[PDB]
Each structure stands twice: as C-alpha cells, then as structure tokens.
C-alpha cells in the first residue's frame, strides 16, 4: 500500500484529507483486475451502470 | 519542489514554536556580567 504515502501524514493538517482516500481505497483482487481489462472489449446484452 | 514550504512534518520537535519562554531569561537565569 503507497497512495496517501510519501512518508508525512504525521501532519495534523492532513487527517481529513487522511480517511477521504483510505475510505476510497479497495484491495488488489486478482480476479477483479482481470474483470476490468476483459469488459473493455466484451459485447453485453444488460445495460450496466 | 519548493525550498521554504511547510512540509507538516516534526524534527523533535522545533516546528513548534513556544512563548512563555521569556518568564526564565528575566527572573530566574543569571548572565556572566553583573573572566
């Protein structure tokens, strides 16, 4: 993990900024990094959104 | 990357500025005059 990083979220002015990306933030599933690049090219029949 | 920029950061800990350190140069420090 290394998006809010940079060492200096030990600043008091950074704590809002802090939850706003880590309650954003989602885990390197395997299987849904590869969901991702195959719905680029796939046809679909359900109007997703 | 500017130079003088307040990168919210803590070198243990002078950052930090505080009064109220005036109250021991008056009444309780003594100086070499008055080798």
Redo the contacts between chains.
């Keep these: 993990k290394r998006y809010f990083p940079e060492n200096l979220e030990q600043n008091q002015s950074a704590a809002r900024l802090v939850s706003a990306v880590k309650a954003r933030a989602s885990e390197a599933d395997i299987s849904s990094i590869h969901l991702a690049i195959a719905r680029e090219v796939s046809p679909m029949f359900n109007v997703h959104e | 990357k500017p130079i003088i920029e307040r990168?919210?950061?803590?070198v243990d800990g002078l950052t930090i500025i505080d009064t109220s350190i005036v109250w021991p140069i008056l009444c309780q420090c003594t100086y070499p005059l008055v080798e």
């Design positions: 990168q919210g950061e803590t």
